[PDB]
């Protein structure tokens, strides 16, 4: 019934007999998807400057590696920002508090977020019975997957780009600790001398 | 040391202050404190008396020895301030003894 | 199919049962008529087996109970760190170990307690600690208090998480019986994840944090001036400079060129001469090996794939002629009885804590450990105790299994049956061997006292006159020091200086030196072995006849915990298994007490002291070998002479130890009232007192009752132990600190 | 109806009948209805004292930040005391008498609806009536008689009053935790933040607080 | 890297142990040959 | 919370909330009036 089912569970997690807590079918399909959606943001978001900068669109300052942005101060922090990294992290917490807890309240109560006023948006945030796939004019402006078949296939398309982008992030990290360079400088140096620029070296 | 010299206690050949326990040079050593106790002990005892009796008539009294009726106890607590005046009057009245 | 099985929301989480004491039993739930109620509800608070017959509910209770325990322990660990950060001398102690006394407690200024804040060094006034945290901290590479604060806050969070975990796994998602029975999986995960990955990741801490920071400190450079342990990670230039093989990175690892890692992964042994502790490099390699061993070991048992052993198969295989059917039936027992498991586990934990004491005695693993005699005596005595207790507990629960769980009809087992069928021979032989041992150990001391009193020293058991040499022990010592040459070539020095030579000393004090073994040592060991055999006699007799004997054939029906079966049969006082545990505790206390006395006298006389012009002055001047051969020698040269510092501890920082010295005697003696008497007297006393109450209308509804016979015994043994142990506690610490 | 934690339904003991009732008692404090009748007055008075106090700082502080005459709220007690003739112990004791009187009478209206109503005072009968736990009204407490005007007009103010109450209580404690973390006045804390808001936050000096 | 006495012996011990079959057998007898081989190289 | 308060009014809890009170009281009085052998 879940999309991305190619039958891969050595560890009997999704087995619904005597389930409890966070080892719940409804729950994990959710995680994987939200995981997928974030992972694809990170994958395309980590590289883009290193690429676009090298491409010569982005100035000399901005064109940094992913771990040199000021997330991990000791690996490098940026300067040229609207503010310091901590006056940001607060603007983050308030926002992600709102926009993650709301999303939790659709999971917890389907109908909720539809009733209690929220600057006109309460009309929007009704849900879709299914949690992972809310839609409505906010989160599906183009009304794509107009049929049940075309939707199920788009749900197939989503999870696979995701799972790939999650491994890609497991990539960029495990890669950055051993190399100490960004996964686009690793790629171009690997085009130049495939056997010299390698794990084994 | 200065505040025992001002108090005027009797110090022996030892160099330590000994105490006087009968009559009036050294009343405050024992004679005053003594009443202090018999009061506060009598206070505690008579509050405890008025609690156990006040429960006694209520189907199962044993529950009130454990899940103590706090707002009963805290009313008896203050009532137990004037206890010798009640304790005497109760010895008079003849409700004090079985 | 080993898999996650859980019940959803089995118990609602309102305070409806808090407000009802004794909810857990139908008997107590009715309320108190007598005061005995009060005791009973605390006695049986954790006794889940009598509450319910359901193995599921019990199983859910037991670990949630364990999550609660772990929460408490974290909170405890949190405590020590915080105080070590907030109320301590550690930074002062991280700059002149030799001349600062470790302190991590301050008293408030009221009621003269101020005097307890003693002259401990580093410009700080306080209580000298003997827990040994300061050395842990140096071993872990801790340099500043801030770090201790941060560790403390982490422990508090972990406490919260464990408490959450325990509520969760009972009130939201309680695992199913099936779950708890996945023994093979439990064993594998505990061996490989917990121990294996534990010592592996630790070894990570040791190789990346401990080893570098330690070398710079031992070099002598000011701790404030020492680089921070994350910069060791991102600047490996500092690590390359300290040990060269880092230049090659993790390449030598994969290429199997491990010999290049001989910089920080050694096998030298002995002590670090500048600190009197084991090499951290030896320890790092120790944990590295151990991690691999445990990791591969944790892949023995069958789980969700064909591969792996089955416990039941290995058990059912192992049978022979003399035993009949052998191990058969044991798996089923040890997958259905918590008691049996508890019994096993307590025996081996306990044994472990004692071996930990010794191995920590002989091989000080922390910096400036060996030379902090207070810490060393405290730790060895402590760990020797808790072991003691745990072993007796093993016996207790073994018997509880024997009474409550054993059912031959349903869960048969023959090993057990054959043991039961010849118990009489076992107990009779243990009896014999114990009288033997008693005579040929105590008897030797009495003989010595008599010969010494009658003016015949040439007839005594002593190195001078009689020789009873520990020839074996001396052989093994011989083999141990010569081992680095022949049987362990790659090892540079000995494991310990108490076997080898090379007397290593720090700050003018003796860290460690060869321990001579003579007649006196021959004596005390055989006393021990006597004491252990007696304790085993009591406890084994307790467990084997828990169910039935010639006197009481139906003892099994009467319970584990019960006083007697009357004055009949001539009199049947203390027949129960509990009573065996009862008496077992006294002999255990006896045995353990001679061990630690042995330890303390041994250490002050033959080992510890100051180091002068090419020579050694021991604390008690090697009197042991000549004095410990008579009871009078203990009485005078140990007890009488050593108690000096405790008895005059008044007016000082150590006065609390004098107070506790007296208080512990008080409480010890106080136990004797309960132990020597019986509740018949007490109940009549109580009758008269109750009269007096009723006369004044002050009688309680909860009818005042004397303690049960069993409770009298429990209170007795408890106060006896607490008194005894606390007295020895005040003794040693005031002694060794002063 | 609107709630504190949208989606999560409000607890039974809250009706939507009381002013500023947003289904918020996550700790089950005000469950037993008497013990909540008690808290609806604590909250009101707390908020009324807090409002007077916040209005009390917010005007002195601009008065000090408009002309160099008025003192900062922190060091503005001694400035009142030292400069002027008066002593501390007596004020503190005078206060306790008047506030003692004022409270001890409100004290015996919580337990007894219309107690002080009996005229047992200065013949003032009708002014010390009950009315509604938290709003006493009459010619003294509600001189203009918004209390005795209209049903809706008064209901809306209960709403206004508790909210302002709760905002002033927040506001006040900021004043108190802002002097603490930065050692300055609340229109120096406000001027510094308007000129360079991205940098002059807590992030600078004001820690987790 | 594909050359020295380190690797020559490792590949020989794996193919020797495997010769003595679903998914569970390969990862086992593969870890046997590697469980074997490592001691030969750290040895010789 | 009728239930939670009954628990807080249990014997062992009251005893402790009572003893920390009459302990403090006696520590407190020994602070501002230190070291008495009279009054
Ligand atoms: C809500 C109650 C309340 C609060 C929070 C304060 C808080 C303060 N008063 Mg105020 N007062 C309060 C009520 C009252 N004060 C006074 C009379 C005084 C005096 C006489 C003084 C203060 C002072 C102070 C300050 C003491 C410095 C300190 O503690 O630093 C830590 C502090 C900011 C002192 C001050 O201004 O010092 C700077 C001072 O001189 N207060 C009275 C009596 C009428 C009050 C009655 O409720
Ligand atoms: C949610 C994921 C995520 C996160 C946390 C970040 C975080 C960041 N991005 Mg962004 N980025 C993302 C997704 C994300 N990116 C994606 C999906 C893309 C593709 C469009 C980019 C493309 C991108 C560019 C082109 C640049 C950043 C930059 C930055 C940094 C400064 C933010 C800013 O511009 O103001 C910051 C570390 C800027 C920087 O300084 O680098 C910048 O110029 N990002
Ligand atoms: C409400 C509490 C209360 C009260 C008012 C009394 C009152 C009394 N008790 Mg006490 N008693 C109490 C609780 C109380 N008891 C409790 C809780 C215990 C158990 C620890 C005892 C145990 C006790 C004993 C053992 C004795 C008294 C005795 C007495 C009498 C003499 C005073 C004394 O020694 O004490 C006195 C009538 C003595 C007596 O009867 O004379 C006496 O021997 N009581
Ligand atoms: C890698 C996984 C892992 C790890 C590291 C641990 C670690 C731990 N388990 Mg174990 N446990 C595991 C898997 C694991 N377990 C598995 C798979 C099972 C079987 C399904 C169990 C079942 C289990 C039980 C039943 C209990 C523990 C308990 C414990 C703790 C024992 C005390 C100690 O050493 O501290 C410890 C933290 C004890 C506890 O929670 O305390 C306890 O009672 N574990
Ligand atoms: C983690 C270890 C552990 C655990 C969980 C238990 C658990 C238990 N023990 Mg205990 N026991 C232990 C260690 C342990 N013991 C040790 C170390 C000793 C040696 C002193 C004993 C000696 C002991 C005795 C003597 C008795 C128990 C008994 C009990 C039960 C009642 C305890 C209570 O509610 O009070 C309970 C099942 C009682 C029972 O009847 O069962 C009982 O009589 N235990
Ligand atoms: C100095 C005092 C003293 C002495 C001389 C003895 C002597 C003896 N006790 Mg011990 N015993 C003592 C104190 C003492 N006990 C105390 C205080 C207790 C109370 C806990 C016991 C409880 C006790 C038990 C329960 C047992 C002994 C046993 C023995 C005998 C051991 C075998 C042997 O040496 O012959 C022996 C006769 C063991 C035995 O029967 O053999 C045995 O099992 N004793
Ligand atoms: C023909 C193959 C071969 C050869 C030449 C060696 C040679 C050697 N091995 Mg061995 N070893 C082998 C296969 C081999 N090993 C295999 C297959 C295994 C895994 C089952 C091991 C596991 C092993 C261990 C665990 C250890 C050695 C060690 C050693 C060295 C010292 C052992 C000794 O006897 O002293 C020695 C040079 C020891 C060492 O490293 O020193 C050591 O501790 N070996
Ligand atoms: C399924 C299963 C099944 C069976 O039964 C068993 C097994 C197989 C075991 C299992 C498992 C699997 C796996 C492995 C998984 C994984 C996952 C992942 C990795 C995820 C990620 C995931 C991931 C993610 C989300 C991520 C994200 C990220 C992001 C946003 C980023 C961001 C950023 C950026 C841009 C920039 C800056 O400067 C930095 C940062 C800030 C950093
Ligand atoms: C919802 C909605 C609604 C409406 O109606 C419509 C619309 C609007 C359309 C929609 C939206 C959408 C969106 C937003 C999307 C997104 C996407 C993405 C971003 C993806 C990614 C995605 C991504 C991905 C896969 C990624 C991947 C990656 C990879 C493989 C990587 C690789 C690598 C590595 C590791 C390493 C090396 O050294 C380098 C490289 C070679 C580089
Ligand atoms: C660098 C790095 C790191 C680290 C890591 C480590 C260092 C780990 C290790 C780990 C390990 C180190 C593991 C191991 C495992 C092992 C095993 C699992 C084994 C097994 C074995 C067996 C199972 C056996 C077998 C056999 C034999 C030998 C004989 C007969 C046959 C058989 C087959 C049975 C991390 C990631 C954190 C981060 C990034 C970087
Ligand atoms: C002055 C003095 C003195 C002397 C004293 C004396 C000589 C005394 C006597 C006394 C006596 C000869 C007494 C008698 C008594 C009797 C009786 C008969 C009692 C009774 C009691 C009761 C009845 C009680 C009750 C109660 C109360 C009131 C409260 C609480 C509760 C109770 C219930 C307990 C001296 C020199 C020392 C010091 C100085 C001062």
């Amino acid at each position: 019934s879940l999309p991305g089912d190619f039958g891969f569970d050595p560890l009997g997690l999704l087995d619904p007999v005597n389930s409890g807590g966070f080892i719940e079918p409804k729950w994990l399909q959710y995680s994987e998807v939200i995981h997928a959606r974030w992972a694809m943001l990170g994958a395309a978001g980590c590289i883009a400057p290193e690429v676009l900068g090298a491409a010569g669109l982005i100035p000399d300052a901005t064109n940094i590696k992913w771990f040199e942005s000021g997330v991990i101060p000791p690996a490098g922090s940026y300067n040229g920002y609207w503010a310091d990294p901590y006056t940001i992290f607060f603007v983050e917490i308030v926002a992600m508090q709102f926009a993650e807890l709301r999303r939790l309240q659709d999971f917890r109560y389907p109908g909720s977020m539809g009733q209690q006023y929220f600057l006109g948006l309460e009309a929007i945030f009704k849900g879709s019975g299914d949690a992972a796939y809310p839609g409505g004019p906010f989160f599906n402006l183009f009304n794509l997957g107009k049929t049940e078949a075309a939707m199920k296939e788009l749900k197939l398309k989503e999870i696979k780009n995701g799972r790939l982008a999650m491994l890609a992030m497991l990539g960029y990290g495990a890669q950055a600790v051993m190399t100490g360079k960004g996964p686009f400088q690793n790629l171009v140096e690997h085009l130049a001398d495939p056997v010299n620029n390698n794990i084994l070296t | 040391f200065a505040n025992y010299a001002k108090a005027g206690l009797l110090c022996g050949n030892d160099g330590l202050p000994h105490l006087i326990a009968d009559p009036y040079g050294h009343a405050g050593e024992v004679f005053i404190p003594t009443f202090g106790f018999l009061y506060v002990a009598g206070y505690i005892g008579y509050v405890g008396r008025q609690y156990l009796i006040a429960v006694k008539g209520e189907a199962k009294p044993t529950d009130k020895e454990i899940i103590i009726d706090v707002p009963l106890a805290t009313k008896l607590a203050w009532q137990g301030a004037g206890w010798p005046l009640a304790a005497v009057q109760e010895l008079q009245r003849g409700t004090l003894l079985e | 199919k080993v898999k996650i099985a859980v019940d959803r929301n089995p118990v609602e989480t309102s305070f409806e049962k808090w407000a009802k004491p004794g909810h857990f039993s139908r008997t107590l739930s009715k309320g108190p008529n007598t005061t005995t109620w009060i005791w009973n509800l605390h006695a049986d608070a954790h006794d889940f087996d009598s509450h319910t017959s359901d193995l599921e509910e019990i199983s859910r209770k037991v670990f949630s109970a364990h999550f609660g325990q772990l929460g408490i322990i974290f909170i405890w660990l949190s405590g020590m760190y915080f105080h070590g950060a907030r109320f301590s001398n550690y930074e002062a102690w991280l700059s002149d170990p030799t001349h600062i006394k470790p302190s991590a407690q301050v008293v408030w200024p009221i009621v003269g307690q101020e005097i307890l804040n003693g002259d401990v060094g580093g410009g700080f006034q306080g209580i000298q600690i003997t827990s040994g945290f300061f050395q842990l901290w140096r071993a872990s590479g801790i340099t500043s208090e801030l770090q201790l604060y941060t560790t403390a806050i982490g422990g508090l969070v972990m406490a919260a998480a464990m408490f959450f975990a325990g509520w969760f796994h009972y009130h939201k998602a309680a695992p199913k019986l099936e779950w708890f029975q996945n023994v093979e999986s439990m064993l594998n995960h505990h061996l490989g994840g917990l121990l294996g990955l534990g010592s592996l990741a630790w070894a990570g801490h040791q190789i990346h944090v401990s080893l570098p920071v330690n070398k710079l400190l031992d070099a002598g450079v000011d701790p404030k001036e020492i680089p921070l342990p994350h910069d060791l990670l991102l600047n490996r230039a500092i690590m390359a400079d300290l040990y060269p093989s880092f230049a090659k990175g993790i390449a030598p690892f994969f290429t199997l060129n491990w010999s290049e890692y001989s910089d920080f992964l050694t096998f030298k042994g002995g002590l670090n001469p500048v600190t009197g502790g084991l090499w951290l490099s030896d320890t790092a390699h120790h944990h590295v090996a151990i991690a691999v061993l445990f990791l591969v070991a944790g892949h023995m048992y069958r789980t969700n794939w064909g591969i792996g052993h089955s416990m039941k198969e290995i058990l059912e295989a192992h049978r022979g002629p003399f035993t009949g059917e052998g191990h058969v039936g044991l798996y089923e027992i040890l997958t259905t009885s918590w008691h049996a498991q508890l019994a096993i586990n307590l025996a081996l934990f306990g044994s472990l804590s004692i071996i930990v004491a010794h191995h920590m005695y002989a091989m000080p693993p922390y910096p400036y450990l060996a030379t902090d005699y207070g810490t060393q005596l405290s730790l060895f005595t402590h760990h020797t105790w808790i072991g003691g207790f745990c072993i007796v507990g093993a016996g207790a629960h073994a018997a509880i299994f024997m009474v409550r769980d054993y059912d031959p009809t349903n869960n048969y087992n023959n090993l057990l049956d054959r043991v039961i069928r010849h118990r009489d021979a076992i107990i009779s032989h243990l009896n014999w061997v114990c009288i033997f041992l008693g005579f040929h150990s105590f008897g030797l001391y009495i003989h010595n006292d008599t010969m010494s009193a009658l003016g015949r020293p040439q007839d005594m058991f002593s190195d001078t006159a009689i020789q009873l040499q520990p020839v074996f022990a001396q052989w093994i010592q011989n083999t141990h020091f010569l081992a680095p040459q022949l049987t362990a070539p790659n090892a540079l020095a000995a494991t310990s200086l108490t076997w080898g030579g090379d007397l290593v000393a720090v700050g003018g004090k003796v860290a460690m030196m060869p321990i001579s073994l003579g007649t006196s040592d021959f004596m005390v060991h055989h006393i021990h072995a006597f004491t252990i055999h007696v304790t085993v006699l009591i406890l084994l007799k307790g467990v084997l006849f828990a169910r039935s004997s010639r006197l009481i054939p139906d003892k099994a029906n009467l319970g584990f915990r019960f006083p007697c079966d009357g004055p009949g049969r001539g009199g049947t006082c203390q027949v129960s298994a509990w009573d065996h545990v009862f008496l077992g505790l006294f002999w255990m206390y006896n045995s353990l007490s001679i061990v630690i006395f042995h330890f303390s006298w041994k250490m002050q006389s033959d080992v510890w002291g100051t180091v002068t012009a090419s020579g050694v002055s021991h604390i008690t001047g090697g009197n042991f070998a000549q004095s410990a051969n008579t009871i009078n020698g203990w009485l005078r040269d140990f007890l009488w002479a050593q108690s000096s510092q405790v008895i005059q501890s008044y007016g000082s920082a150590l006065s609390a130890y004098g107070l506790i010295f007296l208080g512990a005697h008080f409480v010890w003696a106080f136990s004797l009232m309960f132990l020597f008497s019986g509740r018949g007297y007490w109940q009549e006393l109580i009758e008269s007192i109750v009269w007096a109450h009723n006369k004044l209308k002050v009688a309680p509804a909860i009818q005042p009752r004397a303690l049960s016979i069993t409770q009298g015994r429990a209170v007795g043994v408890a106060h006896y132990l607490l008194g005894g142990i606390a007295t020895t506690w005040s003794f040693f610490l005031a002694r060794i600190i002063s | 109806r609107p709630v504190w934690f949208p989606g999560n339904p409000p607890p039974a003991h809250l009706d939507g009948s009381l002013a500023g009732d947003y289904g918020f008692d996550p700790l089950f404090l005000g469950q037993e209805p008497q013990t909540l009748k008690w808290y609806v007055q604590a909250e009101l008075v707390h908020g009324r004292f807090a409002m007077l106090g916040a209005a009390g700082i917010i005007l002195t502080s601009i008065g000090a930040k408009v002309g160099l005459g008025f003192p900062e709220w922190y060091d503005a007690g001694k400035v009142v005391v030292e400069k002027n003739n008066i002593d501390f112990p007596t004020l503190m004791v005078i206060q306790f008498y008047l506030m003692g009187w004022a409270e001890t009478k409100r004290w015996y209206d919580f337990k007894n609806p219309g107690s002080q109503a009996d005229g047992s005072f200065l013949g003032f009968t009708e002014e010390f009536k009950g009315l509604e736990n938290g709003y006493p009204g009459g010619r003294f407490f509600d001189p203009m008689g918004l209390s005795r005007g209209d049903a809706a007009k008064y209901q809306e103010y209960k709403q206004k009053e508790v909210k302002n109450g709760r905002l002033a209580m927040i506001a006040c404690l900021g004043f108190a935790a802002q002097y603490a973390a930065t050692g300055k006045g609340p229109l120096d804390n406000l001027a510094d933040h308007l000129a360079d808001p991205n940098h002059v936050n807590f992030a600078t000096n004001g820690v987790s607080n | 890297f594909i050359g020295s006495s380190t690797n020559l012996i490792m590949v020989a011990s794996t193919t020797a142990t495997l010769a003595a079959f679903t998914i569970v057998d390969v990862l086992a007898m593969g870890a046997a040959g590697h469980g074997l081989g490592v001691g030969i190289v750290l040895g010789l | 919370m009728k239930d939670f308060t009954t628990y807080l009014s249990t014997a062992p809890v009251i005893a402790t909330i009572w003893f920390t009170f009459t302990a403090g009281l006696l520590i407190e009085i020994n602070r501002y009036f230190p070291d008495p052998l009279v009054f």
Side-chain angles (χ1 to χ4, degrees), chain C residues 261-332:
Chain C
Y261 294 141
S262 63
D263 295 327
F264 57 90
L265 292 171
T266 56
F267 270 67
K268 301 202 177 170
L271 297 173
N272 207 342
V274 189
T275 62
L278 292 174
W279 290 89
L280 274 158
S281 51
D282 283 8
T283 62
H285 191 309
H286 172 199
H287 305 318
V288 160
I290 280 201
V292 171
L293 264 234
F294 270 121
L295 287 166
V296 174
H299 317 322
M300 194 182 139
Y301 305 110
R302 199 180 296 160
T303 58
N304 274 319
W305 297 261
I307 237 176
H309 293 269
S310 28
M311 306 302 282
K312 191 176 74 180
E313 279 194 331
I314 299 168
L315 286 170
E316 285 179 313
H318 292 173
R319 56 195 183 281
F322 294 90
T323 51
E325 296 240 332
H327 305 342
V328 167
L330 267 176
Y331 180 58
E332 294 166 333

Side-chain angles (χ1 to χ4, degrees), chain B residues 11-35:
Chain B
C11 282
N13 299 278
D14 328 3
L16 307 169
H18 310 262
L19 295 173
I20 292 163
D22 173 54
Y24 303 97
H26 303 72
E29 282 189 340
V30 172
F31 163 84
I32 291 167
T34 47
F35 302 157

